[PDB]
Amino acid sequence: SVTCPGGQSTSNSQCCVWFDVLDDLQTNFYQGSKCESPVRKILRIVFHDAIGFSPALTAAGQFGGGGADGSIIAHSNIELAFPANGGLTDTIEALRAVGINHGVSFGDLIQFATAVGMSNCPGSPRLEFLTGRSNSSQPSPPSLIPGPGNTVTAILDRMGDAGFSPDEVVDLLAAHSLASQEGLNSAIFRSPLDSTPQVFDTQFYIETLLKGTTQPGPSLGFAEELSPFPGEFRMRSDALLARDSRTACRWQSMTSSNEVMGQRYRAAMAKMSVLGFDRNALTDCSDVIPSAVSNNAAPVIPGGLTVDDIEVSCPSEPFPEIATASGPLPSLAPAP
Ligand code: HEM
Ligand SMILES: *[C@@H]1O[C@H](CO)[C@@H](O[C@@H]2O[C@H](CO)[C@@H](O)[C@H](O)[C@H]2NC(C)=O)[C@H](O)[C@H]1NC(C)=O
Ligand SMILES: [C-]#N
Ligand SMILES: [Ca+2]
Ligand SMILES: [Ca+2]
C-alpha cells in the first residue's frame, strides 16, 4: 500500500514529496531542527499570508484577497512594502528557493513550514497539514493585517471579517508564546514577549496580565507598553486584548492549561490555513508532521510575583490557582 520511496507509510501519494521538503527544511532553514528565529518569522508569515482575505471587500465588488495562497512570496515585491511586513525579506527568499526546488505551491509550503517549525518547539501540538492549494495568486489588498497600535474594536472587526470570533482571536495569539520583536524597539532587539520564547506554553497569557512595571529599553518603541520585568517586551494590542471585556475571560482561561491552549490553537490554525479555500478539495498529509518533545513544566507566575500582581480582568471567573516561583525578578535574554 502507499509507501513513499524512503519507506515511510502515508495515506496518499500526494504526501510523498513532503518527506523531501521536510528534510531540507529541518537541515537548512531550521539549522538542524532548532526552534529559533526562522520558526518565529514563519509564524508571522503564515498569519500575514492567510489574513489577506476580506469577504467585505468582495461584497463591495473589490478583490478581497486569496487568503492562504502564498501571495506574500509570489507577490513579495508589493506585499513586503506593507507596514506590517518588515523584517521578513530574508525568510521569504529562503522559502522561495525551497518551493521552486521541490515544485510545491507557495501556499502549501508556508502551511507546511509552519507545522514543521512548530514541531521543533517543546510543548507544541501537531498541526493539521493539507496539500493542494493552487500556486496561482493575486497580490493581497493593503490594510488587511492588524497592527499593534490598533484598538481592540479595530482588531476584532478585521479578524471577524476574515471569519474569526473574539475567542478565536485570543486562541490564535498563543503564537506569541514563541515570540520576540525586532522592529518595534530595535534598541532591545529580539526582546521576548514571554519568558520562554522557545517553549509553546501558557506563560504569554500569564505575563501579559501582570502589572506593567518596567521599561526594558532606553526609550519606548512603537506601540510599546511597560512590561513586568527586565528584557521582556509588551506590545499595546496584547496588553489591551488581555484586559478588554470582550476578550478577557478567554485570555484568563488560557493561563492554566497547556493542554487546553494547544487544542484551541490547533483548531484556530486549521481554520486559518484554509482561508480562501475549500478544505474538502485538499488532501490530508498530517501524518508527515513529526511529534514535538513534550513540555513537562507547569505554568508559573515568575520571579516572586503573586496573584496580587496580575490585573484580573475577567469579572465572572476567579483567576486560576497557578504556582509562584521563589526568586528575584527575571531579566530575559534576547530570544535566539
Ligand atoms: C491579533 C493581532 C496581532 C498583532 C497586532 C501582532 C503583532 C505583532 C508584532 C508587531 C510583532 C513584532 C514583530 C517585530 O517587530 O519583529 C509580532 C511578533 C510575532 N507575532 Fe504577532 N501579532 C498578532 C497576531 C499574531 C498571530 C495570530 C500569529 C500567528 C499565528 C502571530 C505570531 C507572531 C510571532 C511568532 C511573532 C514573533 C516574531 C519574531 O520573534 O521574530 N502574531 N506580532
Ligand atoms: C509558483 O508560481 C511562481 C510564480 O508566481 C513560480 O515562481 C517562479 O519560478 C521560476 C522558476 O520556475 C523562478 O525563476 C521565478 O523567479 C519564480 N518567481 C517568483 C516570484 O518566485 C513557481 O515556480 C511556481 N511553482 C510551481 C510549482 O508552479
Ligand atoms: C504577528 N504578526
Ligand atoms: Ca495571501
Ligand atoms: Ca512561551
List, in order of start, the domains of the chain with CATH numbers.
12-145+269-296 (1.10.520.10), 146-268+297-336 (1.10.420.10)
CA pair distance 245, 265, nearest whole angstrom: 21
**Cβ pair 301, 322 in contact under 8 A:** yes
CA pair distance 37, 253, nearest whole angstrom: 28
The residue type at 271: K
Distance 268 CA to ligand 2 centre (A): 30
User: Ligand 1 atom closest to Cα of 47?
Assistant: 29
Instruction: Report helix, strand or coil for 183.
Output: coil
DSSP assignment of 299-325: PEE-TT--GGGB----TTSPPP--EE-
Is 201 among the annotated ligand-binding positions?
yes
Query: What positions carry a catalytic annotation?
Result: 48
Ligand nearest to the CA of 183: 1
Instruction: Report helix, strand or coil for 284.
Output: strand
How determined? X-ray
Distance 184 CA to ligand 1 centre (A): 11
**H helix runs in 165-285, sequence order:** 166-172, 203-208, 236-243, 248-253, 258-273
E runs forming strands in the chain = 130-131, 180-181, 191-192, 224-225, 234-235, 283-284, 300-301, 323-324
Which residue reads 526594558 in cell numbers? 216
Give the contacts of 183 (CB within 8 A, at least 6 positions apart): 86, 87
Phi, psi of 36 (to 5 degrees): -125, -155
Instruction: Report helix, strand or coil for 189.
Output: coil
CA pair distance 131, 14, nearest whole angstrom: 8
Which residue reads 500575514 in cell numbers? 48
- Ligand 1, atom 11, lies closest to the CA of 181
Instruction: Report helix, strand or coil for 181.
Output: strand
